[PDB]
Scaffold this motif. Structure first.
Motif, PDB file in Angstrom:
ATOM      1  N   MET A  99       0.624  -1.312   0.208  1.00  0.00           N
ATOM      2  CA  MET A  99       0.035  -0.029  -0.042  1.00  0.00           C
ATOM      3  C   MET A  99       0.893   1.185   0.033  1.00  0.00           C
ATOM      4  O   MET A  99       0.530   2.304  -0.620  1.00  0.00           O
ATOM      5  CB  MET A  99      -0.983   0.056   1.112  1.00  0.00           C
ATOM      6  N   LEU A 100       1.951   1.280   0.590  1.00  0.00           N
ATOM      7  CA  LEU A 100       3.199   2.139   0.481  1.00  0.00           C
ATOM      8  C   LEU A 100       3.829   2.280  -0.705  1.00  0.00           C
ATOM      9  O   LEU A 100       4.303   3.385  -1.325  1.00  0.00           O
ATOM     10  CB  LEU A 100       4.136   2.157   1.794  1.00  0.00           C
ATOM     11  N   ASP A 101       4.005   1.099  -1.449  1.00  0.00           N
ATOM     12  CA  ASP A 101       4.516   1.042  -2.668  1.00  0.00           C
ATOM     13  C   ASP A 101       3.689   1.317  -3.702  1.00  0.00           C
ATOM     14  O   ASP A 101       4.146   2.341  -4.631  1.00  0.00           O
ATOM     15  CB  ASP A 101       5.129  -0.526  -2.795  1.00  0.00           C
ATOM     16  N   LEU A 102       2.379   1.279  -3.512  1.00  0.00           N
ATOM     17  CA  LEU A 102       1.243   1.555  -4.622  1.00  0.00           C
ATOM     18  C   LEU A 102       1.017   3.239  -4.206  1.00  0.00           C
ATOM     19  O   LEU A 102       0.449   3.795  -5.015  1.00  0.00           O
ATOM     20  CB  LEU A 102       0.022   0.842  -4.316  1.00  0.00           C
ATOM     21  N   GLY A 103       1.457   3.782  -3.027  1.00  0.00           N
ATOM     22  CA  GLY A 103       1.282   5.062  -2.602  1.00  0.00           C
ATOM     23  C   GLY A 103       2.494   5.955  -3.107  1.00  0.00           C
ATOM     24  O   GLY A 103       2.525   7.229  -3.444  1.00  0.00           O
ATOM     25  N   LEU A 104       3.568   5.251  -3.562  1.00  0.00           N
ATOM     26  CA  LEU A 104       4.835   5.717  -4.117  1.00  0.00           C
ATOM     27  C   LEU A 104       4.909   5.750  -5.591  1.00  0.00           C
ATOM     28  O   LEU A 104       5.559   6.545  -6.342  1.00  0.00           O
ATOM     29  CB  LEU A 104       6.032   5.149  -3.524  1.00  0.00           C
ATOM     30  N   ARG A 105       4.132   4.696  -6.112  1.00  0.00           N
ATOM     31  CA  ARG A 105       3.823   4.641  -7.516  1.00  0.00           C
ATOM     32  C   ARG A 105       2.724   5.281  -8.016  1.00  0.00           C
ATOM     33  O   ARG A 105       2.206   5.174  -8.974  1.00  0.00           O
ATOM     34  CB  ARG A 105       3.900   3.275  -7.943  1.00  0.00           C
ATOM     35  N   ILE A 106       2.562   6.647  -7.501  1.00  0.00           N
ATOM     36  CA  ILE A 106       1.357   7.548  -7.633  1.00  0.00           C
ATOM     37  C   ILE A 106       1.856   9.066  -7.889  1.00  0.00           C
ATOM     38  O   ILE A 106       1.872   9.742  -8.755  1.00  0.00           O
ATOM     39  CB  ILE A 106       0.048   7.502  -7.087  1.00  0.00           C
ATOM     40  N   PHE A 107       2.679   9.430  -6.805  1.00  0.00           N
ATOM     41  CA  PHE A 107       3.216  10.593  -6.527  1.00  0.00           C
ATOM     42  C   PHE A 107       4.412  10.861  -7.408  1.00  0.00           C
ATOM     43  O   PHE A 107       4.783  11.912  -7.671  1.00  0.00           O
ATOM     44  CB  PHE A 107       3.641  10.745  -4.955  1.00  0.00           C
ATOM     45  N   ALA A 108       5.115   9.731  -7.458  1.00  0.00           N
ATOM     46  CA  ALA A 108       6.396   9.990  -8.256  1.00  0.00           C
ATOM     47  C   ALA A 108       6.462   8.941  -9.596  1.00  0.00           C
ATOM     48  O   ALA A 108       7.554   8.767 -10.189  1.00  0.00           O
ATOM     49  CB  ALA A 108       7.510   9.275  -7.257  1.00  0.00           C
ATOM     50  N   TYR A 109       5.202   8.830 -10.032  1.00  0.00           N
ATOM     51  CA  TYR A 109       5.041   8.222 -11.380  1.00  0.00           C
ATOM     52  C   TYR A 109       3.956   8.930 -12.321  1.00  0.00           C
ATOM     53  O   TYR A 109       4.037   8.895 -13.468  1.00  0.00           O
ATOM     54  CB  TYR A 109       4.906   6.621 -11.249  1.00  0.00           C
ATOM     55  N   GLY A 110       3.146   9.527 -11.657  1.00  0.00           N
ATOM     56  CA  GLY A 110       1.915  10.265 -12.316  1.00  0.00           C
ATOM     57  C   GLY A 110       0.614   9.682 -12.337  1.00  0.00           C
ATOM     58  O   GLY A 110       0.584   8.440 -12.754  1.00  0.00           O
TER      59      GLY A 110
END
Lengths: 128, 221, 211
Positions: A57-68
């Protein structure tokens, strides 16, 4: 911005991430392969079953803020996957933490559908 | 620093209603869970009611289902139990107890802190204050035994002390028995060295709050 | 519907014995079982939770052991102040069920009652009835018999006994027999006696008065 992206999408992190996708299913399988174990033993199995559900959930939280956030909309292989992670996280946080739920359901299959939906992740990572 | 002080119990006509108040101290009820567990005279423990203002769910036992209504007010931090259509079988001592929530898979929590326990009597028999008759020590010697007799009262209980709580050594206040007549009756004895007779005044202090009767009787040979 | 069978119903044991109360479940119900101790007149107090975890303040002698469906409260060294009733319970709300209850009694050296006789007060005789009280003070065991005899006539059906809860200092019981008569019937006789038969007494002891 995308400064953390230089660190996260490193190929030494993604092997670890998929390693966790496998580790989760390992532990969860040893769990159901040992019906009737110690009370403290059914604590760290669920310990990881939550720990490895919060990491994704943190990994999917980082693949939105730093991925678009707009790269997911027209991406059906990332909508259903994020939806799976959310569903799994909710059902796990219920089954583990929130036992306030004592209303009738006839033993809901969500504890099963989530165990099944944890195979689909591995299914899609052999398709990429 | 954590206390559950309850009140509200008393005599009440069968079919009538009565509410019990379980006041909480040293914790927020809004997060934990409060139960009602009663006990019939000379019987086991029986769980009755449940509430958690957190979830808002409530459960009842079969023998009280449809008649009892357990509420809670987080404003005053107090759980309430409304007992309607009271039957004779409901005559018991009611305790309220707290049990905080477990978030694991062991449920490593029990009902640690209980209430004081309040007596609920369901009958048509009228309230009646007791009468006290001094059990006088007769035939310096060894150790003389005196007491007093609290007789013919309803309902329970009576609190009986000695010398305003001064004398408490070797005092036995027997459990009350229900007489064939329908009234309760107990006796409070005390042993004292014969040397102390006449020169040391003994009084038994009887209090029967149900009837608002309070009597302090002097026991002399 | 989970049946909680608490065995034995009651037990008697000397000071410092190893007491083992067992609570059997009707099926597999995890290990979330409690043990409460209740002294007569007081509120039940928690000893053990989750069937093996000790609560704060509770002495070292209280231990919990769970095996199969059978849970076990164990007191290593029994104390005279352990005179109480013990219950087993369950956790997770809306499914908590109490056990039958076990009455624990302290065994100890024999003690003969101190028998005392009390003639009815004038204040009561004014009312219209008389009550003769026979006090047995501090004895053991609880197995004591009290017979009433007015002018050698064995009264039966007109007296009521009452025994205190075992003492927490010496583990001795105290008994009280109340003989209730009418004023008229009290006047109609002279010698009132209560006769005590007990193990601690080598022979039945009788206390009497007159008028």
């Amino acid at each position: 911005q995308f400064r953390v992206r230089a660190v996260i999408d490193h190929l030494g992190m993604r092997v670890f991430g998929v390693f966790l996708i496998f580790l989760d299913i390992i532990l969860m399988i040893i769990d159901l392969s040992l019906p009737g174990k110690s009370e403290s033993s059914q604590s760290f199995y669920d310990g990881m079953a939550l720990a490895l559900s919060c990491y994704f959930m943190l990994d999917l939280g980082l693949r939105i803020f730093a991925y678009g956030p707009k790269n997911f909309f027209t991406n059906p292989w990332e909508v259903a996957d994020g939806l799976i992670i959310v569903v799994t996280f909710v059902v796990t946080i219920f089954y583990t933490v929130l036992d306030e739920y004592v209303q009738e359901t006839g033993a809901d299959g969500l504890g099963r559908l989530v165990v099944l939906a944890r195979l689909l992740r591995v299914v899609r990572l052999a398709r990429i | 620093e954590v206390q559950l002080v309850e009140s509200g119990g008393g005599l009440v006509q069968p079919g009538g209603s009565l509410r019990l108040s379980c006041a909480a101290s040293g914790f927020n009820v809004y997060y934990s869970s409060i139960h009602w567990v009663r006990q019939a005279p000379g019987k086991g423990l029986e769980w009755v009611a449940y509430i958690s203002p957190s979830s808002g769910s409530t459960y009842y036992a079969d023998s009280v289902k449809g008649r009892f209504t357990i509420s809670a007010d987080t404003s005053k931090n107090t759980a309430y139990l409304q007992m309607n259509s009271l039957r004779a079988e409901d005559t018991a001592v009611y305790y309220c107890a707290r049990k905080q929530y477990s978030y694991w898979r062991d449920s490593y929590w029990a009902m640690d802190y209980w209430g004081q326990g309040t007596l609920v009597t369901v009958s048509s028999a009228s309230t009646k204050g007791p009468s006290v008759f001094p059990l006088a020590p007769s035939s310096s010697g060894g150790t003389a035994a005196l007491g007093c007799l609290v007789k013919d009262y309803f309902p329970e209980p009576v609190t009986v002390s000695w010398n305003s709580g001064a004398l408490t050594s070797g005092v036995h206040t027997f459990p009350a028995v229900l007489q064939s007549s329908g009234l309760y009756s107990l006796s409070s004895v005390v042993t004292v060295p014969s040397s102390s007779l006449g020169t040391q005044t003994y009084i038994c202090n009887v209090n029967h709050k149900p009837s608002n009767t309070k009597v302090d009787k002097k026991v002399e040979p | 519907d989970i049946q909680m069978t608490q065995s034995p119903s009651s037990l008697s044991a000397s000071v410092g014995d190893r007491v083992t109360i067992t609570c059997r479940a009707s099926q597999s119900v995890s290990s979330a079982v409690a043990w409460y101790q209740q002294k007569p007149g007081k509120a039940p107090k928690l000893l053990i939770y989750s069937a093996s975890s000790l609560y704060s303040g509770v002495p070292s002698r209280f231990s919990g052991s769970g095996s199969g469906t059978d849970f076990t409260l164990t007191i290593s060294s029994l104390q005279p102040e352990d005179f109480a009733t013990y219950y087993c319970q369950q956790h997770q709300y809306n499914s908590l069920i109490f056990g039958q209850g076990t009455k624990v009694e302290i065994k100890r050296t024999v003690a003969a009652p101190s028998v005392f006789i009390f003639p009815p007060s004038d204040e009561q005789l004014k009312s219209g009835t008389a009550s003769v009280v026979c006090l047995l003070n501090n004895f053991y065991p609880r197995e004591a018999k009290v017979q009433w005899k007015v002018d050698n006539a064995l009264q039966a059906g007109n007296s009521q006994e009452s025994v205190t809860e075992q003492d927490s200092k010496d583990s001795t019981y105290s008994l009280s027999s109340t003989l209730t008569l009418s004023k008229a019937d009290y006047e109609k006789h002279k010698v009132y006696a209560c006769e005590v038969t007990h193990q601690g007494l080598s022979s039945p002891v009788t206390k009497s008065f007159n008028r």
